[PDB]
Write a protein that binds this ligand. Structure first.
Ligand SMILES: [Zn+2]
Lengths: 97, 405, 48, 49, 149
DNA sequence: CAGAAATTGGCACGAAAATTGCCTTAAATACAA
DNA sequence: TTGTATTTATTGCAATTTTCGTGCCAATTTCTG
């Protein structure tokens, strides 16, 4: 259902405290969505993110809303689908934040 | 033949690589060899078309389901303002069983009258009809243009003006004013809110003019260069035996080899570019249509190399002339015969054909025969089929599809 | 008026609708602070 | 998106401070990984560390 | 400055705490009227899909917005511009798009000139007005000068 | 009205041009017997 | 004295694929009697 999907991304988390502590390596690996292996940012030939780079698109998310990187899955009817050709999920481009 | 060892084949393979790929490949060899080294704001949110459409969707008294449908409809709108998916894909993206296509059409007809008008239109006919409906009823030629937009648009597409007069029962006076009114419409309504920047290419070779003669040199910004790490080279002389010295020796050897192979690529590129720009000084002085028909065997006769080397070097490397940026393979072209025993390049015949077509009588366009005969008075000797091939390479419609009133 | 991304649009829509009421939400520059603090190897989090 | 590249006129994506500091670390880490795989002499690996 | 016939006295609080009360003849005689001159620039660069060109026929705009542009696409000297008027008509090329039947239908009816070109023309900023008094054209050596230059 | 002249492009020719995978060692040199 | 392990020097050939211009001819437009 699209109505619930759209309604469930504007909600505000409720809390009453802020806790600070030390970060375990397992905690850091739990935060991450992938490992950065190469120091290149932008291709400069297609002006697209380079794989396993600082500005990568499989680790950090799509560059366009509900649009995969290679271009197989491109619309909102495919939301949540992880492409099998490049591993990019199709969601909002704000998840890069 | 030549005894090909897999260390010479890597030096040969280094030629057919662009500067970006060459710098990408140099990093891998840099991080696998200790003795190698290299010598060396927040932003602003712009408003696109979809953001503008959403700003109006949120301010329109929709319902909870209508707004969800409008989100899908606005999402499937490209930068030209045309709906890129059928409504059956939007009804599927909603993911609800009770919603029918009638509601989707009702929401689409409301989204289609946003700013700009005609946005999110299925095709050109719908996009023109939407704009034609917003005009005041007391408008000249409104019904006459609407009739041919709604019924006979293929005839106007093929410039079949004769058939339009018969089917629409119209004279010359109205069939020109109505068509002018149609051309007054906006074909792409979504390009009003257009945001973006073009993409640039940093050249490899720079050619300029100095003291009346052309000078050529490699672009010093993008040229790749490596260096030997002296601190590790100072450890060669028996810091410790066996590995401690053998490793440094066997890596210094390969670093020297790689640096030599990079210099042997830069020099070859520079010499090939200098020969190329020396053989076609006519092109840079007075633009196109004066370019000579040269091939690989012509270049691999003054620099004294093999044709396969010239083939590899000129791959994906750009040259910056005062005219513009070129591929450095754009200068190798075919040829056709000429009066006087000479030859004329295809890249000049294309410019001549473009110039002749861009100056014909609009009422009576020139056909391929009328271009072949016109060219065969300067002694160009081109067959009609070759002229047709050149025109279709230039993406120019045939003569019967260029006439107009 | 400054930072809550999802509250700006709601406030604008309510003002245009003749209803002067806001849903406060959370500023977007404290999430940046959390992401920059926890990229130093320090586990800071909101709880409950 | 919290460390974006700066687009200035001319097609130039100048690398910011944080991206430079990340690229330096990634280069050193990759070099150290390769050297540890190659079984390099301890002097070079100590300098790399 | 200017010589003003001044008087020292309180006048109903309109010169309270360093304020100044000015007559209407000072405004009628244009004694403190000044002239301010502001410059704007339009640069045509070289892209990979061909170069940008300065032209007087922008595809999407109407015939009114091009009323004060000459044959070379540059505003007339002496024209009173305001708001978002077009000063220099500049077009950047978009290309390398594969043809489709809808794209062919769009290109046939409205002509090939409208397609494959964008609009990057220079326009007056918002809230800026004045009169065009000087136009300067700098052309790189090798490029062919237009009629204005 | 309608047959004929004109136009257009898919498909087919030989020849030329451009690519791509390899001979995956021979000769000069310093050292040892 | 010579035989040999060591170290340079070597950025081309020759098949194989692709592209070239131009003729044949069927399908679609235009034109004059
Ligand atoms: Zn993909």
């Amino acid at each position: 259902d699209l109505l619930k999907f759209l309604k469930a991304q504007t909600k505000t988390e409720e809390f009453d405290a802020i806790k600070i502590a030390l970060a375990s390596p397992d905690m850091i690996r739990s935060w991450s969505f992938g490992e950065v292996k190469k120091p290149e940012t932008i291709n400069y030939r297609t002006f697209k993110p380079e794989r396993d780079g600082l500005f990568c698109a499989r680790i950090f998310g799509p560059v366009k809303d509900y649009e995969c990187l290679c271009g197989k899955y491109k619309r909102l009817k495919h939301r949540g689908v992880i492409c099998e050709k490049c591993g990019v999920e199709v969601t909002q481009t704000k998840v890069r934040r | 033949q030549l005894a090909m060892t897999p260390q010479l084949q890597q030096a040969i393979r280094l030629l057919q690589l662009s500067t970006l790929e060459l710098q990408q490949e140099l990093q891998q060899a840099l991080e696998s060899n200790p003795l190698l080294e290299q010598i060396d704001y927040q932003g602003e949110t712009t408003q696109t078309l979809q953001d503008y459409l959403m700003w109006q969707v949120e301010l329109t008294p929709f319902s909870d389901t209508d707004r969800a449908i409008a989100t899908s409809i606005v999402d499937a709108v490209d930068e030209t303002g045309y709906l890129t998916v059928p409504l059956e894909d939007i009804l599927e993206s909603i993911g609800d069983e009770e919603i029918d296509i009638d509601e989707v059409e009702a929401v689409l007809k409301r989204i289609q009258r946003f700013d700009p008008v005609g946005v999110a239109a299925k095709d050109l006919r719908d996009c023109l009809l939407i704009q034609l409906s917003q005009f005041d009823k007391t408008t000249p030629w409104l019904e006459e243009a609407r009739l041919i937009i709604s019924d006979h648009l293929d005839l106007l597409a093929n410039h079949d003006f004769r058939t339009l007069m018969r089917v629409t029962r119209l004279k010359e006076d109205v069939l020109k004013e109505a068509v002018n009114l149609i051309q007054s419409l906006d074909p792409r309504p979504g390009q009003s809110i257009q945001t973006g920047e073009p993409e640039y290419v940093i050249p490899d070779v720079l050619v300029r003019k100095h003291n009346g003669h052309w000078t050529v040199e490699l672009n010093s910004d993008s040229i790749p260069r490596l260096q030997i790490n002296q601190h590790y080279a100072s450890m060669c002389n028996n810091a410790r035996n066996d590995g401690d010295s053998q490793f440094i020796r066997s890596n210094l050897q390969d670093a020297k080899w790689l640096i030599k192979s990079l210099e042997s690529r830069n020099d070859t590129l520079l010499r090939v570019s200098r020969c190329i720009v020396e053989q076609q000084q006519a092109f840079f002085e007075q633009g196109e249509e004066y370019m000579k028909p040269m091939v690989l065997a012509d270049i691999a006769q003054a620099v004294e190399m093999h044709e396969s080397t010239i083939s590899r070097v000129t791959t994906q490397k750009y040259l910056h002339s005062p005219r513009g940026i070129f591929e450095l393979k754009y200068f190798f072209s075919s040829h056709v015969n000429t009066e006087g025993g000479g030859e004329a390049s295809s890249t000049a015949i294309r410019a001549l054909v473009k110039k002749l077509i861009a100056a014909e009588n609009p009422a009576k366009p020139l056909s391929d025969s009328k271009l072949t005969s016109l060219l065969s008075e300067q002694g160009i000797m081109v067959a009609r089929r070759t002229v047709a091939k050149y025109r279709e390479s230039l993406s120019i419609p045939p003569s019967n599809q260029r006439k107009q009133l | 008026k400054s930072d809550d991304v999802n509250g700006r649009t709601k406030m604008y829509k309510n003002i245009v609708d003749g209803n002067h009421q806001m849903e406060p939400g959370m500023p977007e520059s404290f999430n940046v602070l959390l992401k920059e603090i926890r990229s130093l190897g320090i586990n800071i989090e909101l709880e409950d | 998106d919290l460390r974006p590249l700066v687009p200035l006129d001319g097609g130039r994506f100048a690398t910011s401070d944080l991206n430079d500091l990340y690229r330096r670390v990634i280069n050193r880490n990759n070099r150290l990984k390769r050297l540890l795989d190659l079984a390099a002499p301890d002097i070079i690996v100590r300098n790399e560390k | 400055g200017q010589n003003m016939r001044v008087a020292f006295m309180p006048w109903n609080g309109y010169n309270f705490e360093d304020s100044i009360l000015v007559s209407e003849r000072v405004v009628q005689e244009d004694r403190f009227t000044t002239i301010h001159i502001q410059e704007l620039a339009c640069v045509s660069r070289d892209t990979k899909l061909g170069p940008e060109e300065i032209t007087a026929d922008i595809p999407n705009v109407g015939e009114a917005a091009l009323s004060k542009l000459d044959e070379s696409g540059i505003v007339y000297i002496g024209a009173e511009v305001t708001g978002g008027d077009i000063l220099v008509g500049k077009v950047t090329p978009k290309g390398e798009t594969q043809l489709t039947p809808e794209e062919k239908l769009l290109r046939a009816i409205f002509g090939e000139k409208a397609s494959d070109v964008k609009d990057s023309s220079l326009r007056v900023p918002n809230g800026v007005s004045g009169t065009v008094i000087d136009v300067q054209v700098f052309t790189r050596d090798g490029v062919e000068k237009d009629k204005r230059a």
